[PDB]
Amino acid sequence: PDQLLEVSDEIATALAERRPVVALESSLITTDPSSETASLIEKAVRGAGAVPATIGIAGGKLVVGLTDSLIERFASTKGIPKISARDIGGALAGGGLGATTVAGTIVIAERAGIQVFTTAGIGGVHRRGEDTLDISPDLLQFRKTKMTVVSGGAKSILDHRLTAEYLETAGVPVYGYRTDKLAAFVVREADVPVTRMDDLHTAARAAEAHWQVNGPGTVLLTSPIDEQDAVDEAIVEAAIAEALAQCDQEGIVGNAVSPYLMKALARASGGMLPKAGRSLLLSTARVAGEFSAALSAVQAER
Amino acid sequence: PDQLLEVSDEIATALAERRPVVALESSLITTDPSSETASLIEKAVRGAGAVPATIGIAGGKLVVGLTDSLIERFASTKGIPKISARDIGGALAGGGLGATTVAGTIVIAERAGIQVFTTAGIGGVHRRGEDTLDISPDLLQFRKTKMTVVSGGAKSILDHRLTAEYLETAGVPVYGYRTDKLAAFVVREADVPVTRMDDLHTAARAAEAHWQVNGPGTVLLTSPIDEQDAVDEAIVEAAIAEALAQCDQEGIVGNAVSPYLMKALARASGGMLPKAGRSLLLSTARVAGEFSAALSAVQAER
Amino acid sequence: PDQLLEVSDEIATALAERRPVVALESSLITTDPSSETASLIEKAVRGAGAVPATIGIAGGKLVVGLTDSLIERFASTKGIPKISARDIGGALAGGGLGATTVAGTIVIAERAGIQVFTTAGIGGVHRRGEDTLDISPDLLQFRKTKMTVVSGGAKSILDHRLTAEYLETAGVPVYGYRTDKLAAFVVREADVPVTRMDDLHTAARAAEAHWQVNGPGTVLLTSPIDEQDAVDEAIVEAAIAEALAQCDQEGIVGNAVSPYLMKALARASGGMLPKAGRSLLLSTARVAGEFSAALSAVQAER
Ligand SMILES: O=C(CO)[C@H](O)[C@H](O)COP(=O)(O)O
Ligand SMILES: O=C(CO)[C@H](O)[C@H](O)COP(=O)(O)O
Ligand SMILES: O=C(CO)[C@H](O)[C@H](O)COP(=O)(O)O
Ligand SMILES: [Ca+2]
Ligand SMILES: [Ca+2]
Ligand SMILES: [Ca+2]
Ligand SMILES: [Ca+2]
Ligand SMILES: [Cl-]
Ligand SMILES: [Cl-]
Ligand SMILES: [Cl-]
């Protein structure tokens, strides 16, 4: 009898039957209201038998699997605040609409009984973070919340190596799917060695064993963008470095720099960034559903 | 039947009756033994109906609400060690007097059943911390201990922005009371956006919901110094920067720099620092008692 | 009925009878298969009545006290991976041999019921860590796992001061045995004040009280190398600084720098490093067994 959880029938049953469920951040429905994107991700997850679970906050409730009605508002309403783990309390108390970030979502996902969550890119150590200390709450949320997060590594505007170092310090397992290098978002690789996992059944058995030993906490699973859709590393690096020089002469610091680089990157891809991002998103999502199916099967042995 | 807790009658009853209680660090009694300061803080807390609870360590016990007898020693004895969370074990084992810091106090406060603690300023990221790694244990204690800490932000000798960044990484909610900027101790504002809370009942409902979702952990509530008593930001900044240059040419590093800046700041205020500090302390304390009363009321609904 | 633990008879009984047990990392058997080193450490621990417990991973099991058969493989097999806390899940899932690091061992030690672990040196903040963010997972593992770790501080290739700062932020108690300065591995002292503990019975009562207040988490106990065997600080510092300059002109960054400094240090000691390391290892181990005996006795009072 949970007062805060709002779970749809399909997801409730799936969990109640130890069937696989894959959590998704509300952002995906917010950005593209057209069936084009939302329907394709759902398609990619359902393929392996996993139930897609889009998570949001609405009317003082932690909604797991938004209704068609709620999907409408998240598309129409413009001023919906981004909610990480720390913003949840206020977001509920306010009773408005809350678009949950990576950190915020996995907390709710765990509470609902969901064990797998997916996104194109996670947060991490911002570039110049060693000085600025701008670090996503995601990384320390992974120490607390039991989950497997399936992504393509950290968002490209971040410092990939420093992020890997921070996660190593924080003791978060990082597995590379059929790869031994860390996935660098739209770029395929970063010069960072990760523990290879060629089989998802094996990988699901590594996480299960991890939770039995280290207790609750996130297993991070990286799946790099298909090489046919990958963006050249040198293109991304020189574009960011140049955009940083503009902020040096203009004199921009803090979380004003962050959205600058995001949109400066969109130009330098030749307008190919959205298609590369969407391509990764889909390949990643497909993997998550497959893993979640594997994980449910491993857990169904005991 | 707790062997380590020493709780006075008034506080025991108040907790046993779900009545509001506000924790205070022993430092306040230590510094000014005169009724002048101690009586005024107690007055400010009791106003809203909250029971003041001064916490210390004495004779291998975690004393919650010091007796008149103990208050005497904390005033007379000169060599009383400062005790943070990590020093507690030894402090008890030694059986001496222990003046608990912010980090140390909230641990004991939680253990006793207290949910609200107040101080003028909390610890944080020291200036040049990005290089020196000098960071108060307070910030990571807030991940563990369930409490609402009511302060005026970080002590002025610290790096306010970096502290805000560290707390964001650590997932500690920061609420500004009727303000949207972070309180910078004796200075009213720092250029750091905080989540606004205009009503303490609303704010108490945000914390309660936070604990139900993210489990135990501190909600940090900032209440800026009354503007009529606020110290000019530019006065504080130039005074510290100059004092830092003296340590550069003298060649001072580490926790030798910290007390230097503290006392160099006292001069540059025109001797107005103690009155500005005491003014903030009182306004902050009054808020804490009011919040604690609100929190008890929210919790009394279930 | 634990499926993952593999405990030898002697250790099982010792724990089942609240008798002292001291955990050891598998590395010691791996490096020197000759009875020379392994027999002497075992001798040093058993002296105080403590049961030595060497921990490893083999055939999907968390082996506590390796058999003569397993000791053979850890000596003969060359490609045995180093396993920290985060690597455990995969290591078990793989069913190979896993040589557990400091971080990995204490997790298993706790699970088995062991409360004391020893090593010559622990991990910490790497030199230039304030920029590189290269920090051992050990330091944040100490927030989670209940244990007393007996060492000679951080390995000499690390930044001792920054490590001390990081552990202070993380709220890990650091006690110096009959010393008030932090032990700097083969070098006796680092210019860092630590809380003095002259009596191990007192020290064991400080840890016990710490766990009762701050819950699970590591108490770190430093015991400096016997001065008669200590290496001059200036020798170590100038040797490392020079070795760093070689990596600057050669252009080496990351975890390629780490093993460089390790082996560059071995030369500059005049070949005395192994004997100084082994000397510390033994003095440290002897202390651990004595402490574990004291701790068991304190706990046997209730
Ligand atoms: O995907 C996200 C938002 O939906 C991440 O959680 C976000 O990028 C991290 O936040 P920040 O780096 O600004 O702290
Ligand atoms: O208010 C305090 C002491 O009473 C704080 O806890 C203290 O300022 C933090 O310690 P440090 O910054 O030296 O680690
Ligand atoms: O003693 C160890 C290995 O046996 C330590 O755990 C290791 O030195 C820490 O790892 P790193 O500093 O490379 O992260
Ligand atoms: Ca720097
Ligand atoms: Ca930030
Ligand atoms: Ca410090
Ligand atoms: Ca590292
Ligand atoms: Cl967005
Ligand atoms: Cl003081
Ligand atoms: Cl080694």
Characteristics:
13 helices; 11-stranded mixed sheet; two-stranded antiparallel sheet; alpha/beta; 302 residues; Indigoidine synthase fold; homotrimer; binds ribulose-5-phosphate; binds calcium ion
Could you describe the 3D structure shown?
The structure is a homotrimer of 302-residue chains. Chain A is globular. In chain A, 48% of the residues lie in helices and 19% in strands. In chain A, the strands form two sheets. In chain A, strands 1, 2, 3, 4, 5, 6, 7, 8, 9, 12 and 13 form an eleven-stranded mixed beta sheet that branches. A two-stranded antiparallel ribbon of chain A has the order 10-11. The longest helix of chain A is centred in the last third of the chain and has 27 residues, at 273-299. The two termini of chain A are 26 Å apart. Chain A has one domain: Indigoidine synthase domain (Indigoidine synthase fold), CATH 3.40.1790. In chain A, strand 5 (82-83), helix 5 (88-94) and strand 6 (97-100) form a beta-alpha-beta unit. Chain A is an alpha/beta fold. The B-C interface holds B 4, 62, 84-90, 92-94, 103, 107-108, 111, 130-137, 139-141, 144, 254 and C 125, 129-130, 143, 161-162, 165-166, 168-175, 195, 197, 202, 205-215, 219. One calcium ion binds next to helix 7 of chain A. The site of one ribulose-5-phosphate has 10 residues of chain C, from helix 6. It is classed as ligase. Keywords: divalent metal ion binding, ligase. It forms a trimeric assembly. The entry is titled "Crystal structure of the prealnumycin C-glycosynthase AlnA in complex with ribulose 5-phosphate". Chains A, B, C are AlnA.
